[PDB]
Paper text:
In this study, we take advantage of a recently identified prokaryote homologue of HCN and CNG channels, termed SthK, which originates from the thermophylic bacterium Spirochaeta thermophila. We previously demonstrated that SthK is gated by cAMP, but not cGMP, and is relatively insensitive to voltage, which resembles the gating properties of certain eukaryote CNG channels. Using X-ray crystallography, we determined the 3-dimensional structures of the isolated C-linker/CNBD of SthK, termed SthK-Cterm, in complex with cAMP or cGMP. The C-linker domain is followed by the CNBD, which contains four helices (αA, αB, αP, αC) and eight β-strands arranged in a so-called β-roll, which is flanked by the A- and B-helices.
The crystal structure of SthK-Cterm in complex with cGMP, which is an antagonist, adopts an overall architectural fold that strongly resembles that of previous structures of HCN C-terminal domains. Additionally, the structure of SthK-Cterm in complex with cGMP, which is an antagonist, shows the SthK-Cterm in a more closed conformation which is similar to the conformations which were previously shown for HCN2 C-terminal structures. In the structure of cGMP-bound SthK-Cterm we observe that cGMP is able to bind in the cyclic nucleotide binding cavity from SthK. Moreover, the phosphoribose group from cGMP establishes the same interactions that were described earlier for the phosphoribose group from cAMP in the SthK-Cterm structure. Remarkably, we observe that cGMP is bound in its anti-conformation in SthK-Cterm whereas previously published cGMP-bound CNBD structures showed the cGMP molecule bound in its syn conformation. The anti-conformation in the cGMP-bound SthK-Cterm structure prevents the purine ring of cGMP from establishing binding interactions with the C-helix or Thr-378 from the CNBD. Therefore, it is possible that antagonism by cGMP arises from missing interactions between the purine ring of cGMP and the C-helix of SthK. Moreover, the SthK-Cterm crystal structure suggests that binding of the cGMP molecule in the syn conformation might be prevented by the presence of the Leu-422 residue which enters the cGMP binding pocket and is equivalent to the Asp residue which has been described to play an important role in cGMP specificity. Therefore, this differential orientation might explain why cGMP acts as an agonist in HCN2 channels but as an antagonist in the SthK channel. Most likely, the absence of these interactions explains why binding of cGMP to SthK does not provide the required energy for the opening conformational changes.
Residue numbers in the entry:
A (entry chain A), B (entry chain A), C (entry chain A), D (entry chain A): 226 to 422
Write the structure that this text describes.
Amino acid sequence: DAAKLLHRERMERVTAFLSYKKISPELQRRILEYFDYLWETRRGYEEREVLKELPHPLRLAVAMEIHGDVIEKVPLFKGAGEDFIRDIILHLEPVIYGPGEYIIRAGELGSDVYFINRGSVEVLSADEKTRYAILSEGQFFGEMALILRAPRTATVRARTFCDLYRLDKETFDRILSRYPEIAAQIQELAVRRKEEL
Amino acid sequence: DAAKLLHRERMERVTAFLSYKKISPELQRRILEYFDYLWETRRGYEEREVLKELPHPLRLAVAMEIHGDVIEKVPLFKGAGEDFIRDIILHLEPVIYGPGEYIIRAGELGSDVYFINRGSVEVLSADEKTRYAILSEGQFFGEMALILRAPRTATVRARTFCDLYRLDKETFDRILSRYPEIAAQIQELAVRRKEEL
Amino acid sequence: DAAKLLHRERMERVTAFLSYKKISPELQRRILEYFDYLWETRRGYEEREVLKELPHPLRLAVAMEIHGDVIEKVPLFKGAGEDFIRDIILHLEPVIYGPGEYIIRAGELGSDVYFINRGSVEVLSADEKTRYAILSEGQFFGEMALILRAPRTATVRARTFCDLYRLDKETFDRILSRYPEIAAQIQELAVRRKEEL
Amino acid sequence: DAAKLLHRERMERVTAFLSYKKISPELQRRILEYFDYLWETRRGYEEREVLKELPHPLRLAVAMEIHGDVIEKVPLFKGAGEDFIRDIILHLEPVIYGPGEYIIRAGELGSDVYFINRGSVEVLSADEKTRYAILSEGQFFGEMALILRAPRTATVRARTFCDLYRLDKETFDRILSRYPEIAAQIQELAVRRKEEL
Ligand SMILES: Nc1nc2c(ncn2[C@@H]2O[C@H]3COP(=O)(O)O[C@@H]3[C@H]2O)c(=O)[nH]1
Ligand SMILES: Nc1nc2c(ncn2[C@@H]2O[C@H]3COP(=O)(O)O[C@@H]3[C@H]2O)c(=O)[nH]1
Ligand SMILES: Nc1nc2c(ncn2[C@@H]2O[C@H]3COP(=O)(O)O[C@@H]3[C@H]2O)c(=O)[nH]1
Ligand SMILES: Nc1nc2c(ncn2[C@@H]2O[C@H]3COP(=O)(O)O[C@@H]3[C@H]2O)c(=O)[nH]1
């Protein structure tokens, strides 16, 4: 069947590409390991480009069904109301991180925020000699950069394979200003996290 | 023949996608019902991407032929003149809404305006305990947000399948300022509608 | 051979599209007449998407070869120097207008300027009861809108099939400010044309 | 195999295109010579569109492997640290210039900077009667326009085939402000180069 059969073929080209510039065995394995994870988690199907078919209301509906877990697992996302969920659901970008991979490095100027569906990460100091926290499902990170209007306060490494939902700075900012009650909670956590650290 | 035969195949992939993440029977039926409506109303043909072939004047001409109904059915669109019709016709985006679907929710920050070619909608209060109006062909909604410079003053639900023409905020604003006489009429309706409600 | 054989097939879809929404015989003939002109003038080949293959210097070189006529036919374009020609050549968009078609209508807010490679046009008053000029190869129009910072001062209709080169407002403005000597000439013509009219 | 077999076919269309508008023998040879160089240097493979498959961390990793030479050959790029390399690596665009081709012309308003992986160039005065320098691997040019906030101070011609890495003005500016120590060095070279010349 179709991309049963098309997703098996994009790795055929990518692997060929990896051999021709002779990519290190370690990196090649990472890439193959990523695509194996992609094919079994999402079936490597462009949820990007089949939702593109649908009109707003039907994409909204589908998105809220396939991505229902994260609203659920995150205490801040539930009790937020239907309003909030509809407003943010189409802006939560699913992203996969391999074990040991760096999501955020302390000192960077990014302000994207990440929500943990599946997996766990570690929050580290800049020299990586200190571990401040392990974070897992229902918890989020990357919020302090925008709220404290500062560079990344810490380094965040995936401890395992991670299903994360990335929320861009603009939407994050837009959402923060549109929901003060939720914004107050995130702001307080951020200060709580920085009068720690 | 061609997309007689290509439009039958994009539903083959989308349906497969719906089964793999196990989308609810109700949502799956909505999607299939939408595409059946798409295939019989537009023959599911990319009027998007065949007009893309043509130069401005020929796209202008084709658009004014295939989308002649809405200029006609809307009293404000006729007597407006050739000037106005040419200026707006390529900015009226055809959009389909299924019965019972929410086009607008009271309190949202959108300013898109919708023109009803075919079908009917209901204008509701925020708690949906009050029905202010049923709107059908020749009538429009979604204009009060920009004119009153406010969030959506009401909720608008499709009562049936609807062929709507969406006009984006920027073009709506551009059109309003470019035609004061038409703008005066819309402004007056908006105030009339808000000293009701 | 290839798009010998692909350009014959895009008209197969477009014609089918024209029959399904039953486009007027007159408009259908215009469209077919346009594509016949396209296939014999350019061989309907995407000079758009084969130049896309090439690096800047080679696209620059090819553009200056295939589009050498207009630099030549326009007195203002020659003696301008290599500097000027290189700076503008990749911004002159080839556009085709059928006989009798409206390129510009008096009162519109566009500021695109057009250069006549092949064909002739007529410059008309707003009510089209007055003909101010016939313009042909080496001559240009659509410059007065930006220079007089005004709406289109007149209506311009193609008298024949026309090969025009469209120069967008931003590039036109950028070019005007970058070459004062050429700008002075265009400015003077524009005032000369408006203390006529 | 695949684009072993697809890259042989894009030249089939481009060559056909070159014959139909009868491109000069000299330009046709340049284009064929470019694509022969493309097919043997990169195997004409879209490193553009296979990296597009990968998530950020894996594209970052691959980019730093395939494009490791330039960080190495350029004294300013080494000792800069991992921070700097990660920040810039995905912004260094590989570009190929044929022998004798003009990369930069004195007086132009561009501010793109170029890093020489392979090949050599010559830095010339505006009238091209003076040769200020030959530049090769590990050296860069095109930095003075932004730093002196001026038009191109000189003309730069490829003496041979060149593998260059282009860094756009915005990223160049962003990088300059983000790393003052490296910025100081480039600024000093630019002044040193202009109190020469
Ligand atoms: N759990 C926990 N997360 C922290 C702490 N300090 C910073 N972070 C998270 O990791 C930080 C990563 O850098 P940001 O400044 O992106 O904000 C993110 C915070 O969400 C801490 O003490 N505990
Ligand atoms: N017909 C009718 N439409 C209304 C009324 N109040 C609001 N609307 C329409 O529905 C509103 C939807 O929210 P907007 O503020 O988008 O402006 C839209 C108005 O076009 C009303 O009293 N009658
Ligand atoms: N040849 C000629 N062209 C004119 C005259 N008046 C306006 N135009 C051209 O036609 C005008 C079309 O509107 P613009 O204001 O685009 O500027 C264009 C001018 O180039 C005129 O008297 N003679
Ligand atoms: N090597 C050398 N490069 C120069 C000199 N003057 C200008 N350039 C380089 O060539 C210049 C090309 O124009 P820019 O102003 O792009 O800045 C570039 C400088 O990198 C010079 O005297 N020596």
